Amino acid sequence: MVEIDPFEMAVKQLERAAQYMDISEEALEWLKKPMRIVEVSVPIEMDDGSVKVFTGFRVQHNWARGPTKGGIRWHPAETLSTVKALATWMTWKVAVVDLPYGGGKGGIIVNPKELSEREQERLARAYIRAVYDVIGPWTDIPAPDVYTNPKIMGWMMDEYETIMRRKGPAFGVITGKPLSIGGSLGRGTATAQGAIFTIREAAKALGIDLKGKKIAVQGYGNAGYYTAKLAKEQLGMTVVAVSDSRGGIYNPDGLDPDEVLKWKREHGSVKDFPGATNITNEELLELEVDVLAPAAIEEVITEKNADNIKAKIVAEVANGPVTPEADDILREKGILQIPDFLCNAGGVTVSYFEWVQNINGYYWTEEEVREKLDKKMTKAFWEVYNTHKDKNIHMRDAAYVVAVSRVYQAMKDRGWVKK
């Protein structure tokens, strides 16, 4: 009994969410299996004049609401139980903000730091020719993810425009494109502006004046850097500690993220930054801040580091930062914590706004996008917040209640489930 299946863990969270609601037992077995899995063979021609064949997947979970939406991963540790896990995870993220979308994910088993520039062109174009049968502007809409760039999503668009012969809105087949091929403004700061909005609305309900409190960030990714910065410019937070894979620093007087990022682009890591103390990743989690925002890795909170954490808000930004073993041990502490797929929902809503502009054909302005981003993210938090205070459940579990009940209500109306 020594095993951890990544897909079967994503089913066992759905069975836990079937007890806080009244759902039919004939539709509960529908959401445990994705509806159309493709596993294509993707041949590229190398630089040496030889041919290699990589395995590429495409998993569409549930299109009951509309088209399906999901990113594309390039990683050598890919499996079918890792794509089917995130594909059944994407449907509870695009339902909770009430978008007409369904889940999905795709991936290729490749290592992208051992392919040159002209070899990535012959892989990203060769992935589209193999799954053209199951994508489209109204069927399946890809997106960028780990080890993909918006440079690459421009290439997949061009190989779609050559197959379709331009008989349709070909700019809407993919989001996260560059600015001058049919992309949207305000896209690079989506997951930051999605997170910092949910930090404000939670703390306004917790009733703490943030203009004078502090914050700590574990990890220094691109969504990790702007999380600290847009808490300083817009919110008013004091960023006191950062970290990465090597080490971490801490300063009790605020650290300006522009000068800090100039260090990490210069040296190997954040080590020996002036006006701080070079510390570790474990002691950073038990610091003293107003809100802890993990955004680096998964399952950093386990059973042995559970009750040492000293914070008021745990902004779940990364994909499942807390294990279910330690969520209840922190629940009795009186710690309000917005969930994982309610904080990073900003990366989908701005990705939805690039799909609206490409279908109609009329591109919006920058502030008009960022003004409608609050309307989605503040409303979708208050629909969860009133549910939690009236049913006495953890907000990790309370978000799953409205997420299934929007999808199950659409499966009952398309005739898919009678009971």
Query: For every residue of 269-335, which 3-state class applies, written as one string?
Result: CCCCCCCCCCECHHHHHCCCCCEEEECCCCCCECCCCCCCCCCCEECCCCCCCECCCCHHHHHCCCC
Whether residues 231 and 352 share a domain: the answer is yes
Whether residues 177 and 201 share a domain: the answer is no
CB 92 within 8 A of CB 13: no
Give, to the nearest 10 degrees, the angle between helix 222-230 and helix 190-206.
50
Kindly list the distances between the CA atom of residue 27 and the CA atoms of 30, 76, 369, 413, in Å, as whole numbers in the listed order. Answer: 5, 35, 36, 13
Residue 297: inside a domain: yes
Whether residues 175 and 253 share a domain: the answer is no
Q: What are phi and psi of 51, to 5 degrees?
A: -115, 135
User: Three-class SS string for 232-243?
Assistant: HHHHCCEEEEEE
Whether residues 136 and 226 share a domain: the answer is no
| 223 annotated among ligand-binding-site residues | yes
Whether residues 200 and 325 share a domain: the answer is yes
- Pick from 351, 410, 372: nearest CA to 70: 351
Whether residues 347 and 223 share a domain: the answer is yes
Total structural domains within the chain: 2
| 71 annotated among ligand-binding-site residues | no
* 63 contacts: CB under 8 Å, gap ≥ 6: 35, 102, 139
**How big is the CA angle at 151 (ends 149 and 152), to the nearest 5 degrees?**
75
CATH of the domain at 146: 3.40.50.10860
Instruction: Tell me which H or E stretch contains 340.
Output: helix 340-343
Mapped onto helix, strand or coil, the DSSP state of residue 142 is: coil
Domain-ending residue, one of 133, 152, 181: 181
Which tokens is 373 given? 């981003």
Residue 13: inside a domain: no
- Pick from 197, 185, 153: nearest CA to 346: 197
| 281 annotated among ligand-binding-site residues | no
Domain-ending residue, one of 155, 181, 207: 181
Whether residues 122 and 229 share a domain: the answer is no
Helices (H) and strands (E) in the chain, counts: 13, 11
| 224 annotated among ligand-binding-site residues | yes
Rounded to whole angstroms, the Cα distance separating 356 from 362 reads 9
At how many Å resolution was this determined? 3.9
Q: Of the listed 69, 84, 105, 177, which one is catalytic?
A: 105
| 225 annotated among ligand-binding-site residues | yes
Q: Which domain holds residue 93?
A: 36-181
Whether residues 260 and 361 share a domain: the answer is yes
Can 389 be counted among the known catalytic residues? no
Whether residues 281 and 411 share a domain: the answer is yes
Q: What are phi and psi of 145, to 5 degrees?
A: -150, -155
